[PDB]
Ligand binder design. Sequence first.
Ligand SMILES: O=c1[nH]cnc2c(CNC[C@@H](O)CP(=O)(O)O)c[nH]c12
Ligand SMILES: O=c1[nH]cnc2c(CNC[C@@H](O)CP(=O)(O)O)c[nH]c12
Lengths: 212, 216
Amino acid sequence: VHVVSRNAEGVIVVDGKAYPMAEELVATESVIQRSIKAVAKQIADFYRPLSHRDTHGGGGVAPISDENPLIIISVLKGSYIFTADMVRYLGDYGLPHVVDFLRVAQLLAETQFKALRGKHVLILEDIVDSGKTLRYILDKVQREHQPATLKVCVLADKPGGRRVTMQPDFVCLTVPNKYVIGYGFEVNDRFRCFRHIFTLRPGEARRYPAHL
Amino acid sequence: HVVSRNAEGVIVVDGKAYPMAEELVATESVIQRSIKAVAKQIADFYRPLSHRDTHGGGGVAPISDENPLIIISVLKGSYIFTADMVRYLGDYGLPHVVDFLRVASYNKMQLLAETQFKALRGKHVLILEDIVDSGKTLRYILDKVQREHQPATLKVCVLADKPGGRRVTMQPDFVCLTVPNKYVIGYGFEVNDRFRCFRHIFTLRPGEARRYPAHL
Ligand SMILES: O=c1[nH]cnc2c(CNC[C@@H](O)CP(=O)(O)O)c[nH]c12
Ligand SMILES: O=c1[nH]cnc2c(CNC[C@@H](O)CP(=O)(O)O)c[nH]c12
């Protein structure tokens, strides 16, 4: 499954498509999807037994259900593709959940959910590298929403890039200590649509200097 | 896929019961086939075109990774459709970038979230939207993007067209699926954020629309 080779220009070819911007393949689509689905099962297994504030039936505590679902906050723009795939796997495993979005760059877009007090909240994020983005988001969500519990699921962990303490509760994949592209990962919004994750050729992070 | 009803008259797809569903509209395989077919049409239409060159600060240049097609996806309902469409657009080699805007009705329309792209003048812009029903949401978005960003061209691709719902003239350029004149759920379509994760699209039993009254 997946034919991985190099053409005469030394460029990586996966299933007949060339990736001239890539240094090495990190993970094929088949490996990525198997990893996400495996973590979806872990998430569903962990949350389905839990209970939290009942906002459907007038208190007090009730099981996670369609009436009181797990609250998922997805971080835009980086996590939208990962989130789309993950929620479908969570549905397959029967986890009741709802998704809202926050956008960070500075907070550019706020959540519209306003009843998260005493609720189980899960953040879906693309990658933990330095740890600074999640420290910022976790502090913000805890103080404004006062959730019962706050956990983080990342598609990717780059353990070698840490500047601050940040250990996600759920991790689908471990990536090399290199700039990654594909499956949501980008260079000025380019390359997010790839089905595979690759490392970027050095210096190519400046390929598109013009602001969109 | 196997689509049937159980002994309680409840629709079952691939062993999973959908008690909130009146009818199945489309299976995952039909939806994905339909999206990929539109991705080919979008790629074939835009691949040969050119627009403002912001990479070489020049005049005009072909759609490329240097000057990509600009896609504006309408949150929240379009995020799953968009995730799938962009991967199919990549399969067909269409250079593109995606930003997001969010809209809501109070009925009259209001912007909830603005796009962050600031150089769209003279660019080809494609709106990705979950559904065209009354047409009011897209008339509002198209009028706003046109006057504020001055794009070279402005087109719309919808996952679903509900033809009977029209109250203002609106025919998206690209349509993946046609749905019945009923409330649809699944594959991004929701009842108070429930049911978006379903891989299939269904019509909603009318009594289920106010099942989840509490604000999230
Ligand atoms: O490898 C990468 N490929 C593409 N984008 C990035 C980023 C930027 N976005 C995530 C960060 O903002 C998380 P943070 O570092 O704060 O934890 C870091 N690494 C990579
Ligand atoms: O069938 C449906 N299932 C779930 N949600 C909806 C909506 C709301 N969101 C889209 C509209 O806001 C577009 P508009 O009507 O203005 O074109 C309309 N139809 C359905």
